[PDB]
Ligand binder design. Structure first.
Ligand SMILES: *Cc1ccc(O)c(C(=O)O)c1
Lengths: 242, 267, 184, 100
């Protein structure tokens, strides 16, 4: 069994838009739940369903509705997107009212008054310091993703076109480029550290990929700049003796 | 002081006849119904005015949702049992759970299930184990015993939660549940056959329904005929105990109710 | 189902022990849960207690005192992968699941041979600075200068050289900005 | 599979007296399964104004019900309780004993 499948993982909305978050489980669980997670507080129940064919309000149901016409599915509907609904949403299921919850992977959702505030990242790879190489026989690449809104990105490292995890550390939260503004654009940094010898091999191609989540190809756009659609932005460096 | 008890029964019927609810839940404090739910109303409702007056709407709303869940779970459990036994047609599935609070403040807690009105599974909350009557019950027993967290949950509910609910409801219903209506007790001579007299000791108007009635000689008489403790319809009960006489001993009816002892000697 | 409290954040060292406390007040109780939530991930079930006492599985223990309204999650032999939010929750008499605000557990790597340095990376066709190889007792302050960005401390695991290191990155648009001084 | 046929007991709330307002009780108990039909009769005819408790549950898994109606007994008025259940090939009639 797949457990709980929740989509989408990321969504930006304009104030006033409606949206359905899908949630399904193949575990024959009676209970399904919708929570929002906001900084500095516990999960807050929006709605729950004790069984197929019944639903009931949680602690913060206002602005949302649900349905449970099947055991498998518990869709959450945002009736009229407001900024206060910017949050992370988790779908969950449990066999019973007292058994452990199984959670979906969540939905990061941002509501903006104005889609002109949406910007894809610029991505740049900074090659290792020659002083680091000489002092440590290690070589730290840095990837910088800058100027993006909302903060809906996944940064991966690719070596010779295969994703890598060893020697990677990515900032857990995008930083604000202007912490005054409520609609500040964001930056994110990541390091990949390899041996000096690995960096020195010109057979080694290094690639920072940033998957950004923004507008749909379907969305209207009347700015001069490129429509800031969901897109992968990447930069690259090649290994080099010296 | 006397024992008090909180019990919740469930009845599931597969392929019920038109009308017959697929599922019913009723709660009792002592002999009084306090709560009802069924698959037709899909609502949990008070069955006593003192439950209605003391539990706000959000109580009934919340238990309504829990009972819709338990109703669905019950339907699946019965369907599975029928599959295990390879039974077609309509079968019944019952659960009873509850606790007693005694005089001393000591407690009991119990949980059992029946299939077609016969004992199927009985919980032992001290050994955290299930007694299974046959092979199919043994199969369910294994599944339930493999979930240590659920067994510990059940033990805690029986010992702490069930007793806290009982005390809350006893307070709510104090004027009904903790009152005494003493019995009106009388002795009737009846010639049951020519030259044969029987004595009837009859009690009515009493609450609670627990009562002790016996006949004694000058020693307890043998072969005493007992009437059931029957509801009179007004919240009180009635019962009797009879002996047949041999054509010299002195006979006396002894009755005990709510800490009062009475003797009716017939001359 | 009134109130639940757990510390906002705890910091401990790799290889050591951390006890995460959770207190609750309720009239009515059907059990207390701990969930683990990795950054950007779903909470996952860790533990369930309902009677008084202690359950252990591997490096994790969960304790419950009913009379004190008190639980702890005990992590032994701490690993970098234990870095996560730990959520305490309990069931009230009506099976209402009441969630704590979560405890963020930060694990400091054990740096046997600290070698702190600030390096300047090769620019891309901006200037980037890297503070690395410092001891886990060093905390990286954010910049005063609003044109100079500094990330939090990040812990990197080069399994390829069985080596761990702390780092922070700093960057600026300024034509007056030196890597050497950027981190204080 | 074990079916249990109902126990059927007919009696007055109070000691009966001719011309004295009483209630006539029919208590049907110890039966399984739960489906049951109960009528109170006056001279073999179905009484209209009859109340009953909800189905009730015993710990031995059987069910019970109380059916009752307000009445004033006389000397020539026959009261009975008629019960049908899957265990009964025809409805069973239990006459009231007029309290012996
Ligand atoms: C209203 C209520 C509470 C608790 C339980 O166990 C039941 C039931 O078993 O039907 C009902």
């Amino acid at each position: 069994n797949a457990g709980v499948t929740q989509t989408p993982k990321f969504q930006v909305l304009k104030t006033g838009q409606s949206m359905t978050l899908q949630c399904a489980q193949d575990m024959n669980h009676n209970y399904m739940y919708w929570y929002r997670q906001d900084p500095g507080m516990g999960l807050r129940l929006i709605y729950y369903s004790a069984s197929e064919g019944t639903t009931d309000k949680g602690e913060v149901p206002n602005g949302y509705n649900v349905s449970r016409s099947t055991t498998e599915d518990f869709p959450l509907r945002l009736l009229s997107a407001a900024p206060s609904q910017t949050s992370v949403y988790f779908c969950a299921s449990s066999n019973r009212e007292y058994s452990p919850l199984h959670f979906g992977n969540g939905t990061r959702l941002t509501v903006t008054e104005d889609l002109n505030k949406v910007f894809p990242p610029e991505v740049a790879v900074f090659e290792p310091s020659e002083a680091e190489i000489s002092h440590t026989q290690k070589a730290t690449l840095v990837c910088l993703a800058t100027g993006f809104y909302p903060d809906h990105v996944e940064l991966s490292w690719w070596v010779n076109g295969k994703e890598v995890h060893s020697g990677v550390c990515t900032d857990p939260q995008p930083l604000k480029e202007q912490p005054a503004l409520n609609d500040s654009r964001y930056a994110l940094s990541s390091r990949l550290r390899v041996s000096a010898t690995f960096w020195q091999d010109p057979r080694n191609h290094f690639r920072c990929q940033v998957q950004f989540y923004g507008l749909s190809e379907n969305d209207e756009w009347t700015q001069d700049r490129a429509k800031p659609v969901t897109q992968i932005v990447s930069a690259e460096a090649w290994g080099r003796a010296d | 002081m006397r024992t008090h008890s909180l019990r919740y029964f469930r009845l599931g019927v597969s392929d019920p006849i038109h009308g017959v609810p697929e599922f019913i839940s009723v709660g009792y404090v002592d002999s009084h119904p306090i709560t009802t739910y069924d698959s037709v109303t899909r609502q949990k409702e008070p069955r006593a005015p003192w439950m209605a007056e003391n539990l706000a709407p959000d109580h009934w709303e919340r238990y309504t949702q829990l009972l819709r869940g338990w109703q669905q779970m019950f339907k699946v459990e019965l369907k599975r049992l029928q599959r295990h036994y390879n039974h077609s047609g309509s079968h019944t599935y019952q659960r009873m759970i509850g606790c007693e609070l005694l005089e001393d403040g000591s407690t009991t807690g119990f949980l059992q299930y029946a299939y077609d009105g016969q004992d199927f599974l009985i919980f032992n909350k001290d050994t955290l184990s299930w007694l299974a009557v046959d092979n199919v019950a043994h199969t369910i027993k294994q599944a339930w015993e493999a979930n240590q967290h659920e067994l510990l949950y059940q033990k805690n509910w029986l010992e702490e939660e069930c007793i806290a609910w009982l005390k809350r409801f006893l307070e709510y219903g104090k004027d009904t549940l903790q009152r005494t209506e003493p019995p009106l007790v009388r002795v009737n001579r009846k010639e049951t056959f020519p030259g044969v007299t029987a004595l009837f000791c009859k009690a009515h108007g009493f609450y609670p329904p627990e009562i002790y009635m016996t006949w004694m000689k000058n020693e307890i008489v043998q072969e005493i005929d007992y009437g059931d403790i029957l509801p009179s319809g007004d919240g009180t009960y009635q019962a009797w105990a009879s002996i047949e006489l041999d054509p010299s001993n002195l006979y006396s009816c002894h009755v005990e109710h709510s800490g009062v002892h009475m003797v009716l000697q017939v001359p | 189902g009134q109130n639940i409290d757990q510390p906002t954040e705890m910091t401990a060292t790799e290889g050591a022990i951390v006890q995460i406390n959770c207190t609750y007040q309720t009239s009515g109780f059907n059990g207390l849960f701990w969930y683990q939530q990795h950054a950007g991930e779903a909470p996952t079930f860790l533990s369930y207690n309902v009677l008084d006492g202690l359950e252990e599985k591997g490096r994790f223990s969960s304790f419950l005192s009913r009379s004190k309204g008190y639980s702890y999650l005990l992590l032994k032999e701490l690993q970098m992968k234990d870095s996560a939010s730990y959520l305490c929750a309990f069931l009230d008499s009506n099976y209402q699941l009441i969630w704590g605000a979560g405890t963020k557990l930060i694990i400091k790597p054990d740096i046997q041979n600290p070698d702190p340095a600030v390096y300047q990376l090769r620019d891309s066709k901006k200037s980037v600075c890297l503070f690395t190889d410092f001891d886990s007792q060093t905390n990286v302050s954010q910049s005063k200068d609003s044109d100079v960005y500094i990330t939090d401390k990040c812990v990197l695991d080069m399994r390829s050289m069985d080596f761990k290191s702390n780092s922070a990155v700093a960057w600026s648009n300024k034509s007056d900005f030196a890597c050497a001084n950027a981190f204080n | 599979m074990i079916q249990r046929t109902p126990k059927i007991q007919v009696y007055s709330r109070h000691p009966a007296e001719n011309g004295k307002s009483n209630f006539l009780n029919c208590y049907v108990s110890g039966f399984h399964p739960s489906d049951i039909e109960v009528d109170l009769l006056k001279n073999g005819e179905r009484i209209e104004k009859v109340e009953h408790s909800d189905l009730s549950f015993s710990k031995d898994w059987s069910f019970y019900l109380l059916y009752y109606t307000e009445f004033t007994p006389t000397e020539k008025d026959e009261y009975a309780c008629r019960v049908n259940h899957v265990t009964l090939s025809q409805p069973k009639i239990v006459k009231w004993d007029r309290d012996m």
